[PDB]
Subunit: 219 residues, 4 copies
DNA sequence: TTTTTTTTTT
DNA sequence: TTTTTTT
C-alpha cells in the first residue's frame, strides 16, 4: 500500500519550516476533524520533522538561508499516531549565485533586449524521413541545436504544413496551406521555415512538446 | 508605479509556461474588457520568453534543472503590452548533484529516530531587566542565538514566557513556578531545556515576533 | 496607465485577510528592501483594507465565513505610502451550497461511479463540411451537446482520422490510418467514432480545446 | 494505514479536470520515475476520474462552470495499479452570485471606502474572570460577536495590558503599561480598548487566534 | 474556440 | 514540469 507524501515543493531554506507545517496540516485536515488526530499531534509531528531537517540542512549540507531546498518524506497515520518513514526522506538543494555575478550581466543584456524582442527567430531544418502516405518530416533547429519538428503533406498539387518548436519559445505552426507542387517540397521548407513560424501560435511548452513527439513518431 | 510580472521559484526548464501563466492571470481583466486579446498577451509572454532564453541559457549558462526567479515591470498602453527591461531582475540557484547529497541524506535518515527523541538542549544568558522588573534572558542553541525568555518575579513565585526559532519554532506558554526571586537566575540555567521540552510547536513567524517582543523590553 | 493590482484569487471568506496580506507583501517585497516602504507600512495598509473589506462582505454582501470570495483592487505607492483606488475594487462571491443538499447526491452517485468508470463513452458525430483540399470535418457530440471535433483525410482505399473531445473527459485521437474507400468515409466515421476514442489519449483540457479549433477553423 | 488523498482545493468548475490531472501527476511523480507507474497509467486514472466527476458536477449537482468546486478522494496504488475509493469522495460546491447584484453594492461602498479607511475600529469588552495570580481577562467583542481577548495585569497604580483580535482585521496588542487604579480597571478597559488597538500590530489571523486562546486558557 | 481560467504569496 | 497549503 502506497503512503501519503509530505512535499514542500521549491522553497527558500529560511521558510521550509512553516512550509512543512502548513502542508502537513492541510493533508491531515480530515484526520483532525474526524478525531483520529489532534492539532497538537500534527504540530508536534511537524516540529519533530523540522527539528531533524534543521540538522540536515544547516549542519550537514551547510545550506544558506537564501538557498533553495525541496524536501519530501512519506508518513503513516495508524491508530491516532503520525509516523515518518525516514527511508523515504529525500532532500534537494540549490545554491544561490551571488548578485554581484548576475546583476551586471542581466543589466548588460537588458540594453540589447528590446532589439531581440522584435527580431524574428530564424530556423534551420533537416529532413528526417517520409511516411507511407508521403508526408515529409523535418527536424527544426535553433543555433545548431534541435528544438522542434515539422511535417509537410503534399496534396492535389499543393502542400500542407504543420509543426512546433519548444525553444527559444514554445511555438505551434497551425495547419497551413502554401503554394507548392510536390516537386518543390524539400526546397520550400528550407526557404520558408523561419518565415512560417513568424506567424505561429505562442503556446505552452507541453503543447509544443506533444506535437513534436507526434510528428517524429510517424517516422 | 507599474505592474510587475513575478514567477516566484521555478525550475529553469519550466520558466516559460510560468511566465505565460502569470501574465495571463494578471491580465484577464484587460482581455474581457476588450483592451487586449489572448493573442496580444501570448505574443507578449512569448517574446519575453524568447528574450529570457538567451539570458538564461547562453549568458548565465543555467542548466534546466536549476532554479530561477524572474521579475519585470510592464505597462499596457493602447491595446499593447510593453516591458520595462530596466526593471528586469533574475535570480539563479545552481543545482547540487545527487551524488553529493544523497549519501549524506541516507546516513542521517538512520539517525533521525534517535535524534527525534532527544531533548533540545538550550543555554541562556542574562540580557537585562525591564522597567517593571522582569528579567530577560537570551536563549542559545549550540552557542548561537535562537530565542529569548522573560521571567516575572513574584512573592515566592515566578512567571515564565519565551520562544525559540531554531532548531524548531517553539512557544513557551505563560508558566507559573514556585521559586524564590534570589535563585531565579540559577533556575533558568538549570531548567530552560526542560521548560521547552513541553513547549508548543508553532510557526516560525510567531516565534520570531515573541522573541523580538521580549528583547524589545530591554 | 494601468496600476499594480492586488489579487486574492479564489479564497474561503474566513481567510481572505491573510491572503491580502501575503499578496501585498509579495508584490511590495522590493519596495521594502529598497527602503521606499517599511514592513510596518505594508502591514498597516493591508490591515486597513481588510477592515474595510470585512464591512463589505459581512454587512453589505452578507457573506458567510465559509463562502468563497475573489477580491481585486488597484493600488499605487506615493511618497512612502500605499494608496488604494477603490474605483477599481471588484468583488466576486460564491455562496456555499449546504452539505445536507450535496452529500446525499454524492453518496448515491459514488455507488454507481466505479461501474461507470469502465463504460465506453458513446459518441455521435455531425458533418460540418469539407476543407479546401478535401478533408471532411465532423462535430463530435456527447448526449446531444457539442464536445469536440474530428477531421478525416481521404486516401486511396485508406483514410487519416484525427480528433479531440473536451467532455466528458479530454481525449486526443492521434493520427490514425484506416482501411476505407472515400465513398465510405461518412459511413465509417459515424460507425467508429466511439470505438476510436476508446483508445484515445487522456490529455489536458486546453490541449483538446486547441485541437478542436484547429480542426473547426478549417471549415469556417 | 491511511491512504493518499487527491485534493484540488478551490477551483472554477470549468477547470476541475486539468486541476485533478495536475495534482494527481504531482503526487505520483515518484511512482512514475521509479517505474511503478507509467504516464499512461496516471493519465488514464485522472481521465477516468474526470469522466465520472463530469456526470456528478454537470448532471447530478447541476454545477455551472462559473461555480467553485472542491473535490477530494482517497486512492491506492497496489502492484502497478491505481485505485480510487469512491466512498471517500467529497465534493463541495459554491454557486456564483451574479455581478448585476454585487457590482452596485460594491460601487456605492467604494464611494464611502476612503472615509472608512481612516476610521478607528470601535470595540467592546466583557469580564470573563480572573487568573490565579490576579490578572483580569476580558472578552473583546465586535458587533456583539466575540472576536478576541484581553488580559490586564495590575501593578501599583499601573497595569500591563495585552490582547489580540481576529476581526474585522487581525490585530495584536503588544505589552503596554498604563496608569490605572486596580478598582478602576473594568472602567479603564471599557474606555480604552478601541484606543489601545488603534496602535496594535497588524498580524496574520493565526497569530491572533493563538494569543486569544492563550489568554482565555488562563481563565477559571 | 475556449468561455472558465492560466501568479506572486502559501 | 505538473498540488495541497485554516474550520
Amino acid at each position: 500500500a502506497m503512503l501519503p507524501t509530505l512535499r514542500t515543493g521549491l522553497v527558500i531554506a529560511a521558510g521550509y519550516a512553516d512550509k512543512v507545517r502548513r502542508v502537513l496540516f492541510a493533508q491531515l485536515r480530515d484526520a483532525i476533524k474526524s478525531g483520529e488526530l489532534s492539532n497538537k499531534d500534527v504540530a508536534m509531528a511537524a516540529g519533530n520533522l523540522n527539528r531533524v531537517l534543521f540538522e540536515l540542512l544547516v549542519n550537514k549540507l551547510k545550506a544558506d538561508k537564501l538557498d533553495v531546498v525541496r524536501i519530501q518524506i512519506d508518513y503513516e497515520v495508524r491508530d491516532s499516531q503520525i509516523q515518518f518513514d525516514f527511508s523515504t526522506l529525500r532532500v534537494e538543494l540549490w545554491r544561490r549565485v551571488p548578485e554581484e555575478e548576475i546583476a551586471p550581466i542581466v543589466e548588460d543584456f537588458a540594453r540589447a533586449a528590446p532589439r531581440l524582442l522584435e527580431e524574428e527567430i530564424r530556423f534551420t531544418v533537416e529532413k528526417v524521413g517520409e511516411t507511407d502516405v508521403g508526408d515529409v518530416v523535418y527536424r527544426i533547429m535553433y543555433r545548431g541545436s534541435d528544438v522542434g519538428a515539422l511535417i509537410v503533406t503534399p496534396l492535389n498539387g499543393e502542400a500542407l504544413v504543420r509543426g512546433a518548436v519548444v525553444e527559444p519559445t514554445p511555438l505551434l505552426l497551425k495547419r497551413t496551406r502554401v503554394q507548392v507542387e510536390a516537386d518543390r517540397i524539400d526546397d520550400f521548407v528550407r526557404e520558408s521555415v523561419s518565415r512560417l513560424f513568424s506567424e505561429a501560435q505562442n503556446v505552452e511548452k507541453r503543447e509544443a512538446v506533444r506535437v513534436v513527439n507526434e510528428i517524429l513518431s510517424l517516422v
